[PDB]
Amino acid sequence: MNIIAILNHMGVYFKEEPIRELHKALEALDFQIVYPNDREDLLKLIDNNARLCGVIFDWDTYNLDLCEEISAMNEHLPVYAFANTHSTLDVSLNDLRLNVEFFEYALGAAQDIAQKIRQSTDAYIDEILPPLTKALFNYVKEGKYTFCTPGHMGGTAFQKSPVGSIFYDFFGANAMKSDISISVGELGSLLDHSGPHKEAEEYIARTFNAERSYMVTNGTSTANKIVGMYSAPAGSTVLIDRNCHKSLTHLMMMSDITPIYFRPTRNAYGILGGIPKSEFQHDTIAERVAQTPNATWPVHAVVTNSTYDGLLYNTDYIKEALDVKSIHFDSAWVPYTNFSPIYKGLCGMSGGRVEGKVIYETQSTHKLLAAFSQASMIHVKGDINEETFNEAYMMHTSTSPHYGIVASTETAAAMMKGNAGKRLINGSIERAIRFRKEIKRLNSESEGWFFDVWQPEGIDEAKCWPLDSKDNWHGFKDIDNDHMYLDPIKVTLLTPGMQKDGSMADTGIPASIVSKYLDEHGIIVEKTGPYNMLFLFSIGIDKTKALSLLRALTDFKRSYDLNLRVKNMLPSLYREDPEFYENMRIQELAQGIHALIQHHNLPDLMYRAFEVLPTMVMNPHAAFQMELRGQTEEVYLEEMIGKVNANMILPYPPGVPLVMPGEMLTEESRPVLEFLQMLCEIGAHYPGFETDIHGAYRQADGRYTVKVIK
Amino acid sequence: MNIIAILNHMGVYFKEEPIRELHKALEALDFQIVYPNDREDLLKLIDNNARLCGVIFDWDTYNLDLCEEISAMNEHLPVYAFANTHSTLDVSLNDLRLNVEFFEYALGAAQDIAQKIRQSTDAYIDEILPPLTKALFNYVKEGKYTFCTPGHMGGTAFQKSPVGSIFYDFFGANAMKSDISISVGELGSLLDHSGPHKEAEEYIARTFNAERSYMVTNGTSTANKIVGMYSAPAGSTVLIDRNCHKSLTHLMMMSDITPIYFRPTRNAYGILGGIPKSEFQHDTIAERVAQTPNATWPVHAVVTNSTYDGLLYNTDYIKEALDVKSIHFDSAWVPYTNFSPIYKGLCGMSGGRVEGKVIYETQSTHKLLAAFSQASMIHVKGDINEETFNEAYMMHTSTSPHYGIVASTETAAAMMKGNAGKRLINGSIERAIRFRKEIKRLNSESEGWFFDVWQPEGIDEAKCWPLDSKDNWHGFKDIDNDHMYLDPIKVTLLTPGMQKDGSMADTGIPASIVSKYLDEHGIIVEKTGPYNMLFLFSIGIDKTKALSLLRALTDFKRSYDLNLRVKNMLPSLYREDPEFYENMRIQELAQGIHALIQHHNLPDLMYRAFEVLPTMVMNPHAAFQMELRGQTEEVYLEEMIGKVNANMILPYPPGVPLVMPGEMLTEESRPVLEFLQMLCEIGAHYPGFETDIHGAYRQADGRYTVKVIK
Ligand SMILES: Cc1ncc(COP(=O)(O)O)c(/C=N/N[C@@H](CCCCN)C(=O)O)c1O
Numbered sequence A, B: 001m002n003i004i005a006i007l008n009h010m011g012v013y014f015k016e017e018p019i020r021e022l023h024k025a026l027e028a029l030d031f032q033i034v035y036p037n038d039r040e041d042l043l044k045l046i047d048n049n050a051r052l053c054g055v056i057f058d059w060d061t062y063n064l065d066l067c068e069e070i071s072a073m074n075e076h077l078p079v080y081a082f083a084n085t086h087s088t089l090d091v092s093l094n095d096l097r098l099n100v101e102f103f104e105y106a107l108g109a110a111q112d113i114a115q116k117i118r119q120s121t122d123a124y125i126d127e128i129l130p131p132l133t134k135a136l137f138n139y140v141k142e143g144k145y146t147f148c149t150p151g152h153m154g155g156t157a158f159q160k161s162p163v164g165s166i167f168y169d170f171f172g173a174n175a176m177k178s179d180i181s182i183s184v185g186e187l188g189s190l191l192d193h194s195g196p197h198k199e200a201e202e203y204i205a206r207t208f209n210a211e212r213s214y215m216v217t218n219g220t221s222t223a224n225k226i227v228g229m230y231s232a233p234a235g236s237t238v239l240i241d242r243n244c245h246k247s248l249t250h251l252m253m254m255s256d257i258t259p260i261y262f263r264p265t266r267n268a269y270g271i272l273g274g275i276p277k278s279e280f281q282h283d284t285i286a287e288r289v290a291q292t293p294n295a296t297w298p299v300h301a302v303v304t305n306s307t308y309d310g311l312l313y314n315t316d317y318i319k320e321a322l323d324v325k326s327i328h329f330d331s332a333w334v335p336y337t338n339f340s341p342i343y344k345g346l347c348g349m350s351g352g353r354v355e356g357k358v359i360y361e362t363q364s365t366h367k368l369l370a371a372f373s374q375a376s377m378i379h380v381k382g383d384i385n386e387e388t389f390n391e392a393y394m395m396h397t398s399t400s401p402h403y404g405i406v407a408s409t410e411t412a413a414a415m416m417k418g419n420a421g422k423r424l425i426n427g428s429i430e431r432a433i434r435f436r437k438e439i440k441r442l443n444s445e446s447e448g449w450f451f452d453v454w455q456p457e458g459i460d461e462a463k464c465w466p467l468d469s470k471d472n473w474h475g476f477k478d479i480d481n482d483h484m485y486l487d488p489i490k491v492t493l494l495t496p497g498m499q500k501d502g503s504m505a506d507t508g509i510p511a512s513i514v515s516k517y518l519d520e521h522g523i524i525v526e527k528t529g530p531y532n533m534l535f536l537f538s539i540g541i542d543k544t545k546a547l548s549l550l551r552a553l554t555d556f557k558r559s560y561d562l563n564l565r566v567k568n569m570l571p572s573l574y575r576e577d578p579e580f581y582e583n584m585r586i587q588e589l590a591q592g593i594h595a596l597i598q599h600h601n602l603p604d605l606m607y608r609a610f611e612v613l614p615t616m617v618m619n620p621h622a623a624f625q626m627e628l629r630g631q632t633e634e635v636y637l638e639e640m641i642g643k644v645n646a647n648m649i650l651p652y653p654p655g656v657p658l659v660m661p662g663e664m665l666t667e668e669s670r671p672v673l674e675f676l677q678m679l680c681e682i683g684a685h686y687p688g689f690e691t692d693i694h695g696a697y698r699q700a701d702g703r704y705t706v707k708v709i710k
């Protein structure tokens, strides 16, 4: 934060000479000076360089409308106007609202003006930094000696070791110096919500539109467990989105809570849809309660919003219609919903208090904002017993939190404020929409096959596009209207191989091949389904990366159409079993995988296996407890029918839990088993494309076993 | 060739100032000046830096005995003595034989003296360069434009191409400019023996103690074919060393000559021994002639000297005892025998003319001297029809010889001249002997197994050590005395696994594992047997490389004793087959290979298969002609018995021809087949350690087939 832009070349010595002296004095104060040629140049510099901490210009040449243009980009950026002919009578109230400091031209005044500019820069830095992060940085500047944990003592231990010194050089001194503990009393305590931490929490709650907020240093998995434990005592009944992250299943294995499942939808691609509106109704829930043994009226409900693939619920209807006192929106994938009006009504914290209810949002700050991994947030709107919640919170948080992760959470909040933060979010959305339109254009002008994008036909303006029953782009049958919306940030590209009616074509390109090719060429996809690839167009994606992705996709298409050899196209895959992949070409491998998928009818089996719910014989807690008592046996996959499962079976694809612990496959649930059996067969043909079934175990002979209650 | 050493730091201006001015003038003439501190420093500088082209010293400080010391290292190196108090009366006749030029101290004389020194340096360069190489370099200096072959026109074509430019940058401009053809008339012609080429030949014949010499640009394989085709007309009988290179078999395949085989010996390691003296006798040859169909008294004889493993014959006894008018010594591995008295009587060109006989030596200049690959020599001592020999010569030589290869042959000859060349050869021999002694000392010091060296006990002084029937180090049974000698240059290291009596030990380390480890650590062995590794301590081996090899061997021993994992110890082997080599450790792999070798009794089968000669049914020419007519069939190995072989079977180990084309395996020759069958089994257990049988073909099912006369 040390770049100062000087805008003029004035042609009079009485201005130029003081400006040259000021240049020298500022450089003595450790500033880097840049010289834009004109106002458009300056505005571009500001747009492209966030380290620009100040602008100097001549008030005679440029009016204060230049300050208005600067402030529209960054309302806190200090601007220094040098006055010669203008006086106090030439400024208006609106002008005086801007962060402008006025100086005059004089020989010998460079030193005090530079001192004033240094003070203003420090004030700018202080204004944009959040309280905890500022306190941490100031403590580091103090350079105190520690005889307390952590044992590396501000990085000293690393410097005394060869390999430690390599680690220290990689991560840098500041990262080590800022790794501290609650022995440093001036920073307060996260667990006690004291000092700067308290301020941070309030800061976050204000930025994220929450009544209360909590920083979590072990991910949204831990955040979910905190919320669930506070909300669902033992013996209670909980409504669970069947498209729940396995953290919720872990919570159920930990606490003796009886689940009743919301049933979401799916399309032919295996992309998860939303829970239909009828599942939120009182009568449906009551009937399910009546049929479920040891079930009562639910005290807590958990809904995944958004889905992994970017489908958001209209949350106003859910908050109105779900007759449960506590509603928890697992919003891991959408921590940005408060920072753009296009998400209004599509997030848990949207709007005000719901009478008689408490709404939680759990957000993964590290997933789609800028924070270190494991940084997570809990947002609460509604009445809670603060002390009991604090107990549930401390039960899952370490007594030695990583201060860097905490500071990054606060800093993500700070990055979201003001004109600069609005530009960040809006720019990310606009970039995603431009990329989507470009994919559509390239697909249109492609002579043969090209990548498609999963979206409505005519996207024009930045918004969350509704899923409507008439349109068939989304592939969901008989979907409720004004219910599901697509987040433009989450871009799903489709490889050829599936027809528009839900069947698969004669030829196809499985998306795993494309993801491997992209990895070989320096591009990492978020995830890959059978014929879809997910790309996150977050605030960390710039034009360079998007254009590079387009170039990589066209390169893959050209290489595939030339039918290159796997040894050349995919060398790392070839290094897996070089004997198998000799003289094997790309089109043959792709067609073999596609024909294996088709012959086994993978889409129909995947769809049917997730449409029938396996029978719940005991809650996951009881089954897990019996597994802890060593009362389970490993049996083969063909014998699952009638056996109570001890473990969650989570297959990829589609990447969502298929069997929960305590559930039993009956005859009416046989397709589940068939699907799994199928995943075994297809997984045993091409190295590098192995089966991936959590909860199943590959034996030495190549068969698969599962653990069941003995 | 531009480094000038100035030796003094005097205390008088009338000397120092002219020397400083001379420094400046010489640097203007593109010389690099160095300043040794004392005479011992200067002598070390000369010893270590062959680019030192001149020495300047003060005659007052140092007498001309310094010039004697310099000349003992390089008798052509120019020395410039500055005279102040000494006069013409202070030089003796012996002193005036040294290459000393005398100057005086005077201000303003630096330019003239520097010009004289430049002329002397040019004279030195001209004196040590051989004629053809000098002519080639001068032509390149002329920079003529070519409209003739080669088509790259002195490298211009490469410069006009991107990838061509990469190639040109790698090999350099001079390499391209010197690639010329006989369209350049001033260089003469290799095929015509005209101009510089003629001079070169004479130069070579003088340096290598031959009456006539020929340069060959397609290796000693081509040299062997030239000699053989001149010496053995169709229908003649030739005596052939059974340990013959495949080139002699190729000659027999193209020429209708009937062979009778010298039988060499072998030891338990599979190292080839020498032909016993009785095989050279008239009675044995006559008896073999009377039993071979269509055999007459031999007109030509071919003997491999030395063997690959460094065993040299006493060639005087052979020249006296072999009653054949033409004797060809295939001396590919020993081109250096004329340049050290320790090889006296152990090479084909040793001594004078043998009355009534012609002696040939074929030498691979590129193998053990300094020449580009494919550079070879033919040396002739005795009467030949020069015109017929010239026909045999050109009918194996291309009309577009590579001038670089030819020049490198001549330059290797030039490198062998004078005090510098004698120092080269003697230094290489002493270096080899020091390494051998160090291996012995390290083996004595080792606690447990260590590498051994194949040599007699207590080698002391530089010589070719005789193989005697009393000693058992060589492992040859009932060897004639004063017959075979070991070349110290060829260093054979032994890994544990074989006992001193020829039996197989209970534990062993196959040498292929050591060679793979050495390759992984930047050291390339010449070749590897089952329990032996061959290292060539040529004139290209210095102290740095020998110490590096010792360190690598001790590192291997330490790593093996720690029993490291193959994944870490041998990464490339693991990458050959990652599934097989996961979690395998080095000791297990070595012991498995050793037990495979022992259980099949590889040494006994190897020895027995090469002790009985397969029956000749037709000469190799007839069998090869039948193969060219399509009258061969592919059969399996177990059906070998009774089938005339169409191709040479040459297995590794022991790396020498086992079956010749036209030979047939009978019941009495069954062990040969057994050995081969054994090799097949041995090669089918460890990836990276596959079977290697030339003339056998591995089928898809894994079996092996050979081609036989239908
Ligand atoms: C809906 C939902 N709720 C909570 C969490 C846990 O949040 P934390 O991971 O912060 O504890 C995740 C995590 N989802 N992440 C992926 C793998 C990681 C991403 C790889 N680029 C998964 O587990 O399926 C979630 O999807």
Ligand SMILES: Cc1ncc(COP(=O)(O)O)c(/C=N/N[C@@H](CCCCN)C(=O)O)c1O
Binding pocket: B218, B219, B220, B221, B222, B224, B244, B245, B247, B304, B308, B330, B332, B333, B364, B374, B376, B526
């Ligand atoms: C005795 C003998 N006479 C002639 C020749 C042919 O001489 P050219 O190779 O110049 O045509 C060779 C060649 N022997 N070379 C090795 C492999 C190359 C060396 C690897 N570092 C072999 O063939 O087994 C020979 O041993």
